[PDB]
Amino acid sequence: FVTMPAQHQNKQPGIESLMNPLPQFEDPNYKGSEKLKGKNVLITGGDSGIGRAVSIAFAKEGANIAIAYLDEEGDANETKQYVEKEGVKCVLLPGDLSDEQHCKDIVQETVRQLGSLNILVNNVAQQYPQQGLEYITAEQLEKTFRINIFSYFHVTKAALSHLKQGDVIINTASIVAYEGNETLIDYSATKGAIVAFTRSLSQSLVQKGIRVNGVAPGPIWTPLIPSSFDEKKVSQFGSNVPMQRPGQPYELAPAYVYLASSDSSYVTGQMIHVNGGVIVNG
Amino acid sequence: NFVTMPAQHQNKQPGIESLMNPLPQFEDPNYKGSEKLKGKNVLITGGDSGIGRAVSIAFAKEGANIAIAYLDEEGDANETKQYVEKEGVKCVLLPGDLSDEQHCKDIVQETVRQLGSLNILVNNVAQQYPQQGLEYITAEQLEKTFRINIFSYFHVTKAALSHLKQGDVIINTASIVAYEGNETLIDYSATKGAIVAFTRSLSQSLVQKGIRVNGVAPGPIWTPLIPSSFDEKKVSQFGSNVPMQRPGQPYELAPAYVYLASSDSSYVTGQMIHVNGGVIVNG
Amino acid sequence: VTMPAQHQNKQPGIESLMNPLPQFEDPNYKGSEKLKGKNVLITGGDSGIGRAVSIAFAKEGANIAIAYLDEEGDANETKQYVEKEGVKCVLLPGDLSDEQHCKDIVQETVRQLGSLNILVNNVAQQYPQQGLEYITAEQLEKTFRINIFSYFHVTKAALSHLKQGDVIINTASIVAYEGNETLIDYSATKGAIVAFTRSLSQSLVQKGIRVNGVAPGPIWTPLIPSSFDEKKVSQFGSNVPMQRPGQPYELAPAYVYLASSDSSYVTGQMIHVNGGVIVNG
Amino acid sequence: NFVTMPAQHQNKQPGIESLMNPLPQFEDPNYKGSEKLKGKNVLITGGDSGIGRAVSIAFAKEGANIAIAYLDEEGDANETKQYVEKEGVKCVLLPGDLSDEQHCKDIVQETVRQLGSLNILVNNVAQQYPQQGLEYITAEQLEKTFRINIFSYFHVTKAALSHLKQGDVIINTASIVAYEGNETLIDYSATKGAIVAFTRSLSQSLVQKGIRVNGVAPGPIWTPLIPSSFDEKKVSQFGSNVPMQRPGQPYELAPAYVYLASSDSSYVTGQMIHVNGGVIVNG
Ligand SMILES: CC(=O)Cc1cc[n+]([C@@H]2O[C@H](COP(=O)([O-])OP(=O)(O)OC[C@H]3O[C@@H](n4cnc5c(N)ncnc54)[C@H](O)[C@@H]3O)[C@@H](O)[C@H]2O)cc1C(N)=O
Ligand SMILES: CC(=O)Cc1cc[n+]([C@@H]2O[C@H](COP(=O)([O-])OP(=O)(O)OC[C@H]3O[C@@H](n4cnc5c(N)ncnc54)[C@H](O)[C@@H]3O)[C@@H](O)[C@H]2O)cc1C(N)=O
Ligand SMILES: CC(=O)Cc1cc[n+]([C@@H]2O[C@H](COP(=O)([O-])OP(=O)(O)OC[C@H]3O[C@@H](n4cnc5c(N)ncnc54)[C@H](O)[C@@H]3O)[C@@H](O)[C@H]2O)cc1C(N)=O
Ligand SMILES: CC(=O)Cc1cc[n+]([C@@H]2O[C@H](COP(=O)([O-])OP(=O)(O)OC[C@H]3O[C@@H](n4cnc5c(N)ncnc54)[C@H](O)[C@@H]3O)[C@@H](O)[C@H]2O)cc1C(N)=O
Ligand SMILES: C[As](C)(=O)[O-]
Ligand SMILES: C[As](C)(=O)[O-]
Ligand SMILES: C[As](C)(=O)[O-]
Ligand SMILES: C[As](C)(=O)[O-]
Ligand SMILES: C[As](C)(=O)[O-]
Ligand SMILES: [Cl-]
Ligand SMILES: [Mg+2]
Ligand SMILES: [Mg+2]
Ligand SMILES: [Mg+2]
Ligand SMILES: [Mg+2]
Secondary structure (H helix, E strand, C coil), X not given: CCCCCCCCCCCCCCXXXXXXXXXXXXXXXXXXXXXXXXXXXXXXXXXXXXXXXXXXXXHHCCCEEEEEECCCHHHHHHHHHHHHCXXXXXXXXXXXXXXXXXXXXXXXXXXXXXCCCCEEEECCCCCCCCCCHHHXXXXXXXXXXXXXXXXXXXXXXXXXXXXXXXXXXXXXXXXXXXXXXXXXXXXXHHHHHHHHHHHHHXXXXXXXXXXXXXXXXXXECXXXXXXXCCHHHHHHCCCCCCCCXXXXXXXXXXXXXXHHCHHHXXXXXXXXXXXXXXXXXX | CCCCCCCCCCCCCCCCHHHCCCCCCCCCCCCCCCCCCCCCEEEEXXXXXXXXXXXXXXXXXXXXEEEEEECCCHHHHHHHHHHHHHCCXXXXXXXXXXXXXXXXXXXXXXXXXXXXXXXXXEECCCCCCCCCCHHHCCHHHHHHHHHHHHHHHHHHHHHHCCCCCCCCEEEEECCCHHHHCCCCCHHHHHHHHHHHHHXXXXXXXXXXXXXXXXXXXXXXECCCHHHHHCCHHHHHCCCCCCCCCXXXXXXXXXXXXXXXXXXXXXXXXXXXXXXXXXXXXXX | CCCCCCCCCCCCCCHHHCCCCCCCCCCXXXXXXXXXXXXXXXXXXXCHHHHHHHHHHHHCCCEEXXXXXXXXXXHHHHHHHHHHCCCCEEEEECXXXXXXXXXXXXXXXXXXXXXCCEEEECCCCCCCCCCHXXXXXXXXHHHHHHHHHHHHHHHHHHCCCCCCCCEEEEECCCHHHHCCCCCHHHHHHHHHHHHHHHHHHHHHHXXXXXXXXXXXXXXXXXXXXXXXXXXXXXXXXCCCCCCCCECHHHCHHHHHHHHCHHHCCCCCCEEEECCCXXXXX | CCCCCCCCCCCCCCCCHHHCCCCCCCCCCCCCCCCCCCCCEEEEECCCCHHHHHHHHHHHHCCCEEEXXXXXXXXXXXXXXXXXXXXXXXXXXXXXCCCCHHHHHHHHHHHHHHHCCCCEEEECCCCCCCCCCHHHCCHHHHHHHHHHHHHHHHHHXXXXXXXXXXXXXXXXXXXXXXXXXXXXXXXXXXXXXXXXXXXXXXXXXXXXXCCEEEEEEECCECCCHHHHHCCHHHHHCCCCCCCCCCCECHHHCHHHHHHHHCHHHCCCCCCEEEECCCCCCCC
16 A cells, blocks of 8 residues: 655665655644753754654753754754754754764763753664565674664763753664564664663663653654665555554654653653554553 | 551542542642643543542643543542633533443433533543452452443443544553552452453554544552552552652643643554553563 | 355354364374373363363373363363373363352362362453444453453362462463454453453462463464354454464463473463464563 | 572673582473474574573473584583483584674584584573663673674574574573663663564564574573672572562473474464563563
C-alpha cells in the first residue's frame, strides 16, 4: 500500500527540504502553556525530523534550545527560525557526534551559551538497511554503534556535571528495539542498547532527582527514511501499522513535552510508544 | 520499608477522601490549561476521588465537560464537582453501582442526555481486597472483584460504542500490579491484567473506526483506595518501595490522562503509560 | 490456505472430527524420567495441547489425572496413549465453571493418585465476535468463569496438597501480549492468567512451589474449528513468521521443561511458543 | 540484603572457576540425556566455565560434539573438555580473543574443519566492569565492553551463516539486566539490551531459511564472572535480592539452552527464557 511518493536521497543524514511532501513538523493548533519556561535544552539531531518537531514544541513551551546536528546547515537554520519565532534562544552546534571529544564540547558549549542545562534529549541516529547479517561489515557495525549509542553515553556523561535535582534526560529509542527489524539488525541492536541504557540510567540517577525516560517511535515521515531505504520501500512506508499511515513528526513532540516537564514528575525508567498502534506488550 | 504517611485505616470501601490525613494533593496549583480538550464530553467512572478526581479536574482545566460516575460518595463527588465547575465547564454527577450491568448502560445513556454527546470514556472504577494468600480469597470476593474491576469496563464501554465516532477516545486505568504482580492482591492483579489485554484488543478492534484506546498503569498513589483496603501499618509505609521512595500524588497522574485523551496522542493506540515512581516493567 | 476448510457447530470441539488430525505426539520424542512418579492434574487434558502434554508427561514417567468437560471419546483416546507408557491415568469429567467441581477434581486426584505434585491449568473456551457490542453478559461471564475463575478455584483447592518442589503451570496465550480484535473477552481472560501467574509465583516462592505459564500462538486443535468460521480455519496460522500453525506436540516440551526440576530456578515466567511472533518477551 | 556466599574476589577477569568457594555446581547428576541433540555440532563461545561449561556438558549428554571458544583460561577449558568427552562426544578447544573480528571468523572455520559442520551456535561470551556511575565509565571501557559482549556476537554469527541450514539453531545469552536495568552496570546492561534486539531481528531475518534464534536471560548465577567483577561483600550477598533468595547454579541454566537448541522448541523463535530466581520482568 502506497503511503508516500517514491523517492530516495544520495547521502545520510537526509535533507528535509528535499522531501515530498515536507514532513509535518508542527501542529498549527498546538497551544503552548509555559510547560518548559526558562528551561535550557540540548537536543542531538534537533535539526530535522522528530528532533525538529521536538525543538519547535519545546520552544512553544518557553524552553531555550541548543541543537546539535552533523552538517545539514539548511535544515538546522530553518529549525532555528521556527524556534526563535517563539521568542526563545536558539544555539546551533554542528559536528560529528561519533567523536567523544565533540560530545563533550557540545555540552560545554550549551552551558556557555545558555548559562546552564536542564533537559538533554539524545536523539541522533543513522541507519543502513542491509538484506542480511552477512552484508553488515565491521566498519558499518561500529559506525552505527558509535553514532547511535556511544554518543548517548558520552553526551550524557558530560551533561551529568551540570544536571541537578529536577533535571531530565530523554532518549529516543525505536519500536525496532521491541519488535525487531530484519533489514536493520545492527540499528535495532543499538536501539535495544538505548532501551537498557534508559532503564539503568534511571535507577542510577533517581536519588539525584534526575528523571530518565524514552520515546519509541514507529514509522515517522522524516529525512532518515528516504536517505536509508529504496524508493519502492519509501513509497509504502507506514502502511504496515494498524493506523495504516506513517506518523508525522509533530505527532511525536507532545510525548517529549510530557517527559521533559513536571507533568511527568512521577515517571522515570519508562518508554512512551508512539507507533500507530503496534502492540509491543508495553 | 519505612514510614511515608501517618498510620490510618477506613473500615468501609470505597474510601472517603475527606477522612484522609494528609488529604491527597489532587490538583497542581501551577497547572495551566491550554484547551487541549475544549468542548469535549467526558464520562469518568470513579471520578469522585483519588486519581479520577485529579483527572476530572485537569480535564475541566482543559475545557472538557465532565460526567462523573461513582458509587455513593456524595460528599467527595460534590467536592469534585465544585472544582470542575470552577473552570466554567459542565459537570454531571451519576451515582450508582457499576457492578450492575443495567446501571453501566444507564450512565452512558444519561451522560449523552445531559451533555449531548460522548467523546472520551475513562474507565477507572476499582475495588481491592488484600488477602495473605489464595486460600483466603472466597469465590464471592473473586467474583465481586472482577464484576466491578473489569466487567464494568466491558459493560460501560460496550454501551459507549454506539456513541463514539472518529476522533473519540477511550482510556482504561490498569495498574503496575498487572506487570509486576502483587502477592497480597492476587484477584485484583488478575483484573488489572484483564484490563491490560482488554486495552490491547479493543485498540485493534476500533482502530479503523478512528477511536483510540490506551491505558495508564499507576504505581502507589495516595488515594481513598489505600486506607480503605490496607491495614494501618502497611498504609504508613505506602510507596516506600519504589525507586523515588514516595507514593505518587493523584495530581501527578492527571497529565498522562490529558495526553492520552487529547489530539496530542493522535498516533498512539494500544499503549500503556506507567506512572509509578521508577519501577522498571520492561515497558 | 494452511488447513482444510472446516467448522464444528459445538464447543468444546472433538479432535476425532478434525481434518487432518492434529499431531499430538512426536514419534521421536524420547522420555528420560524427567517426571518419574510425579502425580499430575491437567485441566482440559483430553485434547489439543492438553492431550499433547498428558502424553509427553506420561512418557516422562508421570501419573496423569485428566479433567475435561464431556468429550469422553477424546478423553478415552488420550487415556490409551497415556497408559501405553505404563503410568496411571485417571479421567475426571465435569464442568469446571462450577466452584465445587473444581474442588472435587483435586480431592479425587489425591484420592486416586495418592498426592498431587504438578497442576496444569489449561481449560478454555473462546467465542469470537465482530465487536464488543456483540458480547452478551452471558458470554463474558461464561468465558471468565471457565478461563480464569477455574484457574483460581482449582489452584486454591490444590494448595492444601502442594509442598516444596511442587509446581503449577498455567496456559495463557499470545493474545494476552498482542491483543486479538475478534476475541476481546477471551483475551482479557488470558491477560488475567498472566497477572495471576505473576502474583501467585511471588506468593508461593517461599513455600518452594513454582508458578509459570505457557503462551501458545496458533495451534491446530479442536478449539479452532469449534470457535472460528470455516474460512478463518483454512487460513489459520498463516499470520506468523513460520507461516504455519504449530502442532500440539510442539507445545509439550515447554510444559515438560516447566514441570520438571530442569526449571528449578524459574518462577513467574512465560514460555512463548508461537511460530516467531515477537512479544517483547 | 543478606549473606548467600563466602566473601571473595579475584584479581583478573575473565574469572577462574577452580578458585571459587563453593565450586559452582555445573552438572545435575540426576540429569539424563535422551539424544535431544543427536548428530549435532555446536560452537559455544565462553563455554569453558560458568553457564557455558554447564551448557557444554548438558549438550554433550544430549549427543552433541562441542567446540568451545574461550579467552585464555586453559585450566578451566581443559577440565571442561574432560567432562564433555566423558559423555562419549568430541570436544574441540579454541582459545583466543573474540574482541578481534578475524578471530571470530577463525573459530567458525576451525569448528567446521575439525567437527565437519556446524548446527548450533551459542553466543555466550561476556565481560563486565561495574562502576558507581556513568561518569566512571571511560570510552576505553565502553568500547571494550561492546566489542566483546555484542560485536563478537555479530561477527561469530555472521561467519556461521554460510554453514547454517534449515534445522540449525542460534542461542544468545542476554541477561535480566536488559529487562530490569542495573545502575552499576550501565554499559554492560546496554550490551545486553543490544543482544535482546539482535535476537529479535535476527530471528525474523532467518526464519525463512529455517534457522531459529532465541535467547536465555539469566538472573544472578554463581559463576567466575561474579567474584572477578564484584567486590567481596557484594559477592557475599549475591542472589539475596531475587524472590528465591539465592543465586542460581550453572546447571540450572543448561536445560533452557537444551530446550532452545533441540527440535523440542521447533515452534519457538525470537524469544527469551528468563532463568532468574523469580524476578518478574513482564515476560
Ligand atoms: C527508523 C525507525 O526504525 C523508525 C523510527 C524510530 C526511531 N527513529 C529515531 O528518531 C531519531 C532521529 O529522528 P529522525 O527519524 O527524525 O531523523 P533525522 O535525520 O531528521 O534526525 C536524525 C539526526 O541525527 C543527526 N546525526 C546523524 N549522524 C550524526 C553525526 N555523525 N553527528 C552528529 N549528528 C548526527 C543528524 O543531524 C540528523 O538530523 C533517531 O534516534 C531515530 O533512530 C525514527 C524513526 C522514523 N523516522 O521512522
Ligand atoms: C491498587 C494499585 O495497584 C495501586 C494503583 C494502581 C491502580 N489503581 C487504580 O486507580 C483506580 C481507582 O482509583 P483510586 O486509586 O483513585 O481510588 P478511589 O477510591 O478514589 O477511586 C475508585 C472509585 O471506584 C468507584 N467505585 C468502586 N466501586 C464502585 C461501584 N460498585 N459502583 C460504582 N463505582 C464504584 C468509587 O466511586 C471510587 O471513587 C482504579 O482503577 C485502581 O485500580 C490505583 C492505585 C493506587 N491508588 O495506588
Ligand atoms: C486460542 C488462541 O488464542 C491461541 C492458542 C493459545 C492458547 N490456547 C490455550 O490452550 C489451552 C488448551 O486449548 P486447546 O487449543 O488445546 O483446545 P482443546 O479444546 O483441545 O482444550 C481445551 C479444553 O478445555 C476443556 N473445557 C472447556 N470447557 C470446560 C468446562 N466447562 N469444564 C471442564 N473442562 C472444559 C475441554 O475439556 C477442552 O478439551 C487453552 O487454555 C487455550 O486458551 C490455545 C491456542 C490454540 N489452540 O490455537
Ligand atoms: C552479570 C549478569 O547480568 C547476571 C547473569 C546474566 C547474564 N550473564 C551472562 O552469562 C554469560 C557469561 O557467563 P558466566 O556468568 O557463566 O561467566 P564465565 O566467566 O563463566 O563465562 C564467560 C566467558 O566469556 C569468555 N570471554 C570473555 N572475554 C573474552 C574474550 N575477549 N575472548 C574470548 N572469550 C572471552 C571467557 O572465556 C569466559 O569463560 C555472559 O553472556 C553473561 O552476560 C551471567 C550472569 C551471572 N553469571 O550472574
Ligand atoms: C565480507 As566482510 C568486509 O562483511 O567481513
Ligand atoms: C516532589 As513532587 C512536587 O512531584 O510531589
Ligand atoms: C456530537 As460530537 C461534536 O461530541 O461528536
Ligand atoms: C473455604 As472457601 C469459602 O474460601 O472455599
Ligand atoms: C573523564 As574521561 C577521559 O573518562 O571522558
Ligand atoms: Cl529446530
Ligand atoms: Mg537533519
Ligand atoms: Mg471515591
Ligand atoms: Mg476436548
Ligand atoms: Mg572462563
